[PDB]
Symmetry: D2
């Protein structure tokens, strides 16, 4: 009775969001449309902002498929949280990192000091390093701190290829790996067009070419640029990527997503959170999927890894 | 072969959006999250704003439940459109006169595209502009629809649900009249699940009309409280528009407080105003009339008269 | 390590179905179509039948929109279960029906309780209200955490048939059947709404509706199973969706309103029996019963429903 | 007025299911849970059954997340139908030859199809009845319709089972296993081992980089797909839940214009070096039915077995045309 209330509270899915701007709120609105989590709690530096955001999302619930309980809370709300999503943060690359780090050192401490023992999903930029921070601050197993990594980049890549191959993006199997940013790399060697092998379609002669494909990846790399170019900021893209990861985690999917994950030998690399294809479930990152990269992608991946470690080097 | 392509194109659902701000884009993201329509086309005065918005939205598609084809287009894309949603305009009587003029360019162009689907108008002052849209289009009145008081009903349901500790999906509650300060709650027809509100307010329960009075004021003035805090409102209506669109596209025969044209119901006529109405693939099937309490009947009649006075110098 | 792996198993939803016939496997199918549980365990005396259903049902999973893990298991798997749904039972005097299944049910519940189960029971086996009471006694569990499907489907049939009559979709018909699930149950005519509109005002204002039609509507709801079973050998699609819907109210902590078998504590002037009534369901089970003021005709009939129920249950307890 | 009302009837999706047994009604049940069509019509020779299945399925509608209009109807109702799903058929009674199985259902199909075309139907046929590839060909002949708009369920369920069992084996959710069964639905069908992915990973590379995994287990996994129906069938009588979801998924690709990839029975025109038969192959489906066949470079072992599959299919079809 005393126990059953406490168990009911724990048996449902609570997501706490920390950082309630457009990326935070785009993701929340995704959660409400799809009714993923029973409780969804908003925490911001700006009280009013988070209060107003929770009001506006709350009014969407009665026209949704099913209820979510959406409210403005605080670090306190994280105790029985299954998942903590952090977009929160502030704007040389080192100044960005070293600032976000101390900011993240406070955020994480308070969440740990709440009795939180769930999963972290880190969406703040630079995502790969801040996931590493969150891990190195939380004291949690490395499989339990996750970054959005190159998921959105992979989605952008699938959309674009689907267009180029005139096929639904849901049937395009395509991945980008490495650090999220200008050093990420398309895994051409493992692109599938439905059942079809990219390299075979390239073999055949038949209007496809690596030149059209290179253009596609640059269009991925610089997507944010174009949107920023054209509406001021970007959020709809990541909102849905953060949702897909959350489903993977909360609904224990064993699904493959290119999250920020900690390498322990795979791809010949280690000691980094980096974008790689990984199986996700209720426990977090179950395993990183290794593939034989082409010698070219190998140089590209290894280069991404070493630049990342160089970015961390003076900050940690 | 020639025909089958043409008919396949027609067999699916195309939604054109005209007006691509937060309100428009929140609705678009709801359609994408929920994969309602196969084609969703964005048009705005800003080529680049519509282009960026379709880019950002399109990259959500590969992680959505099912595909939608999302692109930036033009009034041209309105020809095979099943539903045109309009949130557009430019920022009581002053605003009304220009919004109306601009709506005459918008509507004509869409008509001149060969469009013969349904209109959903979401631009404030919603009730007047739905009337405008109708008067310009030449379409039957049941095929031009406004968002009306759907969002105020949902807010009302959300708050009552809190008050009664019950999911809002089980609160049956409506606000009718003109969307704005003149709207009114239909207390006489509020159900708390199975429970008649009045029978709860007669019992020995901890409820009282004064708590409820404060709830409607909190409903009426909700968007003030939200703007005050985050700078605007768009999530609320985004889903309200989603709801109307499903009712229409999926032929639901479902009841929603849209803006519909009165031809006698509630003792009133010759306005589009918020009322409970059955929607389906054909638009507004019928307005549902209820015996309002004497006070509810007095407030509805007032809302109507104010509306007509607002429209008088414009029409 | 182990402590995270065990918390993982708690941090997902698991349903275990006892009885894998027509009814439970239909429920299973909705549960797979709708991706409601991460885990779905089929239990049955006919151990081969459970293996085959789990095989056949699992095969639908890759083409479902989201995955569920589905396997034939045992009562042991109830340890971390959030909900047990029981459908096992012996077909149709009423008194013999009751003894045969109370015996069965007592063994079922005891076995479940042994594994360490500390979740919610949902009962569907006819006689539903009686068997819900039986389960409550044997489990020792709080009354709230023990629920029957009650008249939820009668209620659904009622809304559908009313939907047809008034020409609006059934999701907008607000209407309830209450009482002992069977031929003593009743429609609460006094609290039927057609969208925003009240049934009583509709019958009285300027139009052509008559209670005569409406009374027939209830008889079709009451005889529906009979009407179905004569045409196609049993009724099961409707009941599956009923169970889907009760299951979602509990696991998704909805606080929604369903006419499930719920434990009376003086609501409607009656007490100390399980019977179909409007209840509010959440993750804790039944959060509260919703009492309404029944017309004197409805109160007479609910009274009768409760007295027959008590008289049916008494000689066997 | 009635030109809007008539256009409304076109602006919604209507499916008419022919045959209301275990298979068709499981499909119906999926269709109701997922709110995929506005209208759903049950048709059956045994008019009693269709009436009660319609009643039963209808009663689930109010508790579905969204509504569907469900009724027992007739061929006449195919006029504005978008899709006719045909599940009517006759069992292969043990002791009888396939040629009698094929023959019973060729004649029945011919008249069914003729009856349908009569009412004015101008939509797409989805066929599930055994023999699926052969009966899809029968429907194409009789309807006179374009090859694209006449589709069988093919190996789609086999592909689903393959993914499921491969999922269990690699410990990844099936939705992330990209794997395909092709050929004639039955005991000549084959897995395209050359084109199996486990998430990102290529099955060949997975085997080649150090491991326990051996093709030996995988070969066992494929045998269990081919055999699964009989494996399910003894433990519970008939198999239907899987095929119901398969029909749901193909319906969704067609009515929702997905351009998604599904191993349906599709009319070969030189792909895989074979032609002029309906057979299970990876195809792109949208609102126009089959948009195209996706040809892959099969292994030599795969190319041999697909040759055998088509050769046996062509030979079984012959004496009954
Ligand atoms: Ca939890
Ligand atoms: Ca869930
Ligand atoms: Ca259309
Ligand atoms: Ca659990
Ligand atoms: Ca149609
Ligand atoms: Ca649809």
């Amino acid at each position: 009775e005393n126990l059953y209330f406490q168990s009911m509270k724990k048996g449902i899915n609570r997501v706490v969001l920390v950082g309630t701007g457009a990326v935070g709120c785009s993701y929340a609105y995704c959660m409400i449309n799809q009714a993923v989590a029973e409780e969804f709690v908003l925490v911001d530096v700006n009280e009013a902002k988070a209060e107003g955001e929770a009001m506006d999302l709350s009014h969407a619930v009665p026209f949704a498929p099913a209820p979510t309980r959406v409210w403005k809370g605080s670090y306190e709300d994280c105790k029985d949280a299954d998942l903590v999503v952090i977009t929160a943060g502030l704007p040389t690359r080192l100044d960005l990192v070293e600032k976000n780090a101390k900011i993240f050192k406070q955020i994480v401490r308070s969440i740990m000091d709440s009795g939180f023992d769930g999963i972290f999903l880190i969406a703040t930029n630079p995502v790969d390093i801040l996931t590493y921070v969150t891990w190195k601050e939380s004291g949690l197993p490395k499989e339990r701190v996750i970054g959005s990594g190159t998921t959105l980049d992979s989605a952008r890549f699938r959309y674009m290829l689907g267009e180029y191959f005139d096929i639904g993006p849901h049937n395009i199997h395509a991945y980008i790996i490495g650090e999220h940013g200008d050093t990420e790399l398309p895994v051409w060697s493992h692109v599938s067009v439905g059942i079809q092998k990219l390299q075979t379609l390239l073999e055949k002669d038949n209007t496809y070419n690596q030149e059209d494909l290179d253009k596609i990846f640059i269009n991925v790399r610089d997507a944010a640029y174009h949107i920023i170019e054209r509406k001021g900021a970007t959020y709809y893209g990541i909102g849905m990527s953060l949702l897909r990861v959350t489903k993977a985690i909360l609904n224990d999917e064993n699904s493959v997503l290119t999250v920020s994950a900690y390498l322990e030998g795979q791809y010949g690399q280690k000691d980094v959170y980096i974008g790689v294809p990984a199986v996700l479930n209720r426990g977090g990152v179950r395993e990183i999927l290794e593939v034989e990269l082409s010698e070219d992608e190998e140089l590209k991946f290894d280069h991404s890894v070493q630049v990342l470690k160089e970015t961390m080097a003076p900050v940690l």
